[PDB]
Design a protein around this ligand. Structure first.
Ligand SMILES: CCCCCCCCCCCCCCCC(=O)O
Lengths: 268, 121, 57, 255, 238, 238, 57, 125
């Protein structure tokens, strides 16, 4: 529960609560009752929505891609990375090291494409989403033998049902995730530089298990990430500039804030 | 049986390429396409089985390695994709020197060599 | 083997929870951990600093 | 009796004295220590020199001019070639240490200015060209200090680091950096600033040559100023002492 | 067969929900946790640390460090104004990009006191006195020291301690104030005036700068998750 | 009618799930179990037994038994190299098809110590001494005995006991190392050098062979099920 | 008649299970049987071999 | 059971094994140790690496011929440029250590010879 105010009165002492030195870097712990007269009011407000969990514990779309039931692109692939979008990336970048379980949710939607084939009577489409850990046999084609998914995890969804959802544990060879890395892949300070060196989360694939209709159909899969059981360390300032790449922090220089008329202007 | 399975690493040996009738128990041999080098452990042969289906096929050849790029004086070489057949290295220069910009590992004769030579900077 | 805990209600009535899976990564989110300690970021100094006293004396 | 403006620090065979100092900032409230048996992963026995490694090393000085943007130092890189510390981290594969940073500036009562002295963990930086990444020489300066730039670095086919002072090369806000353990040197109040940093990382030990854990950033927020007749050359000096340093995996020296 | 009945809100995906779900990797052994310095448990912990306020954000001054310096110099007059801005941490351009402002822009309601710390960055031989005032709304911004003296003020005397803290209290009828711009939840005005005149000896610069830091108080609180306006994107990165 | 509500992840088939399901053959009487020698309860039990390492996998040597023989012979020199390979059980061609490697290729993370057992297969009248060294990464493969002596080594003296065990410990900063090829999780280099010279009497062969076995240590562990790259198929068998 | 058992959590919170069918082949999988005995494959010899002593003496 | 012809020595990250060895000679009956407080003279605190310094370093080999007179080695000089030991003794002014020497020769049952292996203190020449 937030701290209640304390009632005070006038004062003519040698105690100087307001005067301090910020050279030390110590934030002054003064309350309004130190520089004025205050009443005593109980405070019932609560910092329950400001906790790390409630802050990052929401579903956010991190990618979406489109695959068809005919033509060239018969299946879709994605290299797992949370830097593809801006909103969740910027929320995560508040901290240097974060440890969290992941609740993955998938939304799949199909659409009939313009063609000229007559007599179109489709059937229900079923989709398969296969995750390959790094070092696995990646599908080279849509009718690949790798789709057996013996050891590899897979999820099968029929259109018209509730969206698929699964829970993934804290996967990392380290003791926490790293949002930032200040190093090189090689010990000789050459090669890949940045958080890309640490990244190694494998690839995710998706396909139509059946053609369904004699006409063209394009499907689109959306990936949603909700962090849970979150633990975080070392906070850092929010990204002032706009993001440009997913593999690096490269940016274009921007001003600290937005300009007003003069130093005595009450309006923007 | 139908046409033998297409493989990226190797190509069907002559004259099987000009052949369309394969009875059961027929063996076909492959060969490494350029540059690709033959793998000693695997054997490049396939047999038409009774089910009119070819035997399991695996890449019998591997990409050839280009020579080491070297060490450009007062320069940094970036190797994002190894030095195998089809890779591309990048030539850069340090702050204070003026510099081609990139070289490609391509098949030149019976082996693979880099395209552009190392620049001067 | 159920857990009964208080809910989030306004100031100035219990809920029941059972775990069905056996992995501890499939449970719900921990939304009710209200614990703070801002002394690491505010006041990280070595020598204590009393408010009423002068900082540098 | 006592004052609180005087402080002495003794490490190894070295001592540091101060007559006008603010308090001492201690990391995130944590004092550096060794690695415990219930948190280690490597199995061979570590070496702990504890005297030669744990001492004050004094890097070069930099002149503070009326138009200086600021300087930055990578601590694992700065002490890489200096003393036994450099020889230890050279032969060994893994290392773990905490760094105490003392930055000193000297002036009169007629000189004015203000420096922010901050320790940033994992200060990943950007490049002038959006495509491509910064070169090691531009990011790491050893035996010397790297300088920020007042105006934006031009983008071309280059591997130069974006040095804008207002974006601190990370694209963030220079004012918001205070979130990291920091201090100020106000030329009217304190001659020097001292920060004690523990070992922060996501793994217990790490190779000290390919990863730089923390970066020290000295940024003048108020420009140096004086009237004609007073001293025009005002230098800034930085002394770094490693603390509780242990190493693992003895191997052939790495150059 | 246990007879059940399905209520509305079935087979729907509400992004802010809290359910259990089957683990995709069963019996996975996670890396044991280790002690890491500086653990954040609450966002307010981050909002209670000082952050330099870009007060002089006029013209091209935002493209340098001059946006952080408040230019006070000796003049042949008394009672003039140094600076002034409104108490709108979420909306005002002055506090929008400060740690407090960057945390507020993720929420919708805020409530508590504001701490402003002013540090003198002049010579050691310079002296002065300043009036730091806060005026709740109802009458417009005070135009002269006589009108600003009637509010909540502090008289700061520049000396050995170079920093003085002005604590803006909570004088809002509403329990929570809107982060966005709403004229119903008005905040007030914060101004600073020359109390006396800067006194500088010969051979000492007469033009100095002040710096300003802002931090949240112990009673601070925020109450509705939302999405920051600043973050943007035209297409997926890389 | 008990009012219920269906959450997302309903009517879906996750292959790694754990639910009950109705039996198709109810009240079926299974054959009673009998004692069978050699029951496996853990995969690690299989990874802790020795397996001969095909060290000399050069050229056509993989199409015979010569891939298992390390050819050591007497020479007019000292300090030369016998063999050397990296510590990559999952990725290196040397350890990829060993029991340890075949078990690792089903997982993604590995962590523990490695035991290498070298058995001398020469005459009973031959003698020698060898240096078996392991060098953690950071500097490249040691090119000469002076550089390999500075690592973790053992000096093996050939005598009545023909087998010597070199135990590669865990000196990785990461708790778990990737089975696939990642330069972040580097392993190191394992090499062997002539300590002295092979001493052979007259009428005795001067060219001998060594054999190498690899086994997992008690601390070994693996942590992520996946599919082996080696297994393949063009169409359903038969 | 329910069973309450501990879950799989990280080192350094209970789950409930009920059986609905009557065949014992319809239950869930036994994922938590961590018992080992590698003495049958490693060290299958007849005479014990102490580590520090010579093997053949 | 045991034999006495087999001996292993473990120091730092290094190990030495032997199948045909005589006993081990221990100096003058004294085992090496550190310096005591009642026998020291220098006042600053010493450094004790204890792992990298205390390990087996292997110098080069020499061929034994039918007419070889013999060889000699100065131990403070022999390890001067090898490993951290060399770096430690380089930066420091004073040093104190004990040396364990292992000399190995390999032959058959049809080879004959005899070497004397001796440690001379203060071998002024
Ligand atoms: C049946 C489908 C299973 C899909 C499994 C997908 C697993 C994705 C795991 C992502 C973990 C979070 C990655 C964080 C990366 C980082 O910040 O370093």
């Amino acid at each position: 529960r937030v701290a209640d105010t304390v009632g005070t009165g006038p004062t003519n002492s040698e105690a100087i609560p307001a005067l301090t030195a910020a050279e030390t870097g110590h934030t002054s712990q003064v309350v309004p009752g130190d520089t004025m007269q205050t009443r005593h009011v109980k405070n019932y407000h609560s910092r329950s929505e400001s906790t790390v969990e409630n802050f990052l514990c929401r579903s956010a779309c991190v990618y979406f891609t489109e695959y068809k039931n005919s033509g060239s692109k018969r299946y879709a692939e994605w290299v797992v990375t949370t830097r593809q979008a801006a909103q969740l990336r910027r929320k995560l970048e508040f901290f240097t090291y974060i440890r969290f379980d992941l609740e993955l949710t998938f939304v799949i939607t199909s659409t009939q494409q313009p063609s000229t084939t007559q007599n179109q009577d489709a059937q229900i489409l079923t989709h398969q989403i296969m995750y390959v850990p790094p070092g696995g046999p990646v599908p080279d084609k849509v009718d690949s033998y790798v789709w057996q998914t013996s050891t590899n995890p897979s999820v099968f969804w029929t259109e018209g049902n509730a969206p698929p959802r699964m829970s993934i544990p804290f996967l990392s060879i380290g003791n926490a995730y790293s949002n930032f890395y200040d190093g090189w892949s090689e010990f000789s300070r050459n090669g890949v530089y940045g958080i890309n060196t640490l990244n190694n989360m494998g690839t995710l694939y998706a396909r139509h298990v059946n053609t369904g209709s004699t006409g063209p159909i394009k499907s689109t899969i959306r990936i949603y990430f909700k962090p849970k059981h979150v633990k975080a360390w070392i906070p850092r300032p929010p990204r002032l500039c706009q993001y440009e790449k997913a593999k690096n922090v490269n940016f274009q220089p921007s001003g600290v804030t937005t300009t007003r008329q003069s130093i005595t202007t009450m309006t923007n | 049986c139908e046409v033998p399975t297409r493989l990226n690493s190797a190509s069907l040996k002559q004259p099987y390429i000009t052949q369309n009738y394969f009875p059961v128990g027929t063996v076909v041999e492959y060969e490494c396409r350029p540059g690709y080098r033959r793998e000693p452990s695997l054997s490049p042969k396939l047999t038409c089985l009774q089910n009119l289906k070819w035997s399991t096929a695996v890449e019998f050849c591997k990409k050839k390695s280009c020579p080491n790029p070297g060490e450009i004086r007062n320069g940094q070489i970036d190797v994002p994709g190894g030095i195998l057949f089809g890779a591309t290295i990048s030539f850069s220069c340090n702050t204070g020197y003026k510099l081609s910009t990139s070289s490609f590992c391509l098949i030149s004769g019976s082996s693979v060599q880099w395209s552009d030579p190392l620049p001067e900077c | 083997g159920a857990q009964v805990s208080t809910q989030k209600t306004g100031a100035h009535i219990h809920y029941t929870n059972i775990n069905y899976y056996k992995d501890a990564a499939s449970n719900s989110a921990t939304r009710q951990d209200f614990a703070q300690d801002p002394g690491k970021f505010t006041e990280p100094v070595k020598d204590i600093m009393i408010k009423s006293l002068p900082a540098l004396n | 009796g006592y004052s609180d403006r005087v402080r002495s620090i003794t490490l190894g065979n070295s001592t540091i004295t101060t007559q006008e100092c603010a308090n001492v900032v201690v990391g995130y409230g944590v004092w550096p220590d060794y690695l415990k048996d219930s948190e280690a992963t490597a199995e061979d026995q570590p070496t702990q020199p504890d005297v030669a490694t744990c001492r004050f090393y004094t890097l070069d000085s930099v002149q503070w001019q009326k138009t200086s943007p600021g300087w930055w130092w990578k601590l694992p890189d700065a002490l890489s070639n200096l003393g036994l510390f450099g020889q230890n981290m050279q032969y060994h594969y893994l290392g773990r240490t905490g760094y105490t940073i003392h930055v000193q500036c000297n002036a009169s009562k007629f000189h004015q200015g203000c420096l922010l002295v901050v320790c940033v963990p994992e200060a990943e930086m950007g490049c002038a060209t959006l495509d491509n990444t910064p070169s090691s020489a531009e990011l790491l300066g050893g035996d010397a200090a790297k300088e920020f730039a007042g105006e934006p670095i031009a983008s071309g086919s280059n591997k130069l680091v974006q040095r804008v002072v207002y974006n601190a090369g990370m694209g963030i806000g220079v004012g918001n950096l205070t979130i990291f353990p920091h201090q100020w040197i106000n030329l009217r109040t304190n001659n020097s600033a001292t920060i004690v940093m523990p070992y922060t990382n996501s793994v217990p030990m790490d190779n000290m040559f390919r990863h730089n854990n923390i970066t020290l950033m000295v940024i003048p927020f108020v420009p140096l100023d004086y009237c004609p007749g007073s001293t025009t050359y005002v230098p800034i000096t930085v002394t770094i002492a490693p603390m509780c340093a242990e190493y693992n995996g003895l191997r052939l020296a790495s150059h | 067969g246990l007879p059940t009945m399905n209520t509305p809100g079935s087979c729907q995906f509400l992004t802010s929900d809290d359910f259990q779900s089957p683990s995709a990797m069963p019996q996975y052994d996670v890396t044991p946790e280790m002690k890491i310095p500086g653990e954040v448990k609450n966002l307010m912990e981050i909002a209670e640390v000082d952050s330099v306020v870009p007060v002089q954000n006029v013209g091209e001054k935002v493209n340098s460090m001059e946006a952080y310096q408040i230019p006070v110099r000796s003049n042949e007059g008394s009672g003039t104004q140094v600076f002034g801005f409104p108490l709108q941490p979420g909306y005002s351009s002055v506090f929008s990009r400060t740690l407090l402002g960057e945390i507020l822009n993720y929420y919708t309601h805020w409530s508590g006191s504001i701490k402003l710390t002013f540090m003198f960055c002049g010579s050691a031989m310079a002296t002065g006195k300043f009036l730091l005032a806060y005026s709740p709304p109802g009458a417009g911004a005070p135009t002269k020291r006589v009108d600003a003296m009637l509010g909540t003020h502090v008289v700061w005397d520049v000396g050995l301690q170079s920093s003085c803290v002005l604590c803006i209290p909570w004088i809002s009828q509403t329990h929570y104030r809107y982060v966005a711009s709403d004229e119903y939840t008005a905040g007030g005005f914060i101004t600073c005036w020359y109390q006396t005149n800067i006194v500088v000896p010969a051979d000492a610069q007469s033009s100095c700068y002040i710096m300003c830091f802002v931090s949240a108080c112990n009673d601070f609180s925020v109450r509705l998750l939302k999405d920051t306006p600043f973050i943007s994107q035209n297409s997926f990165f890389q």
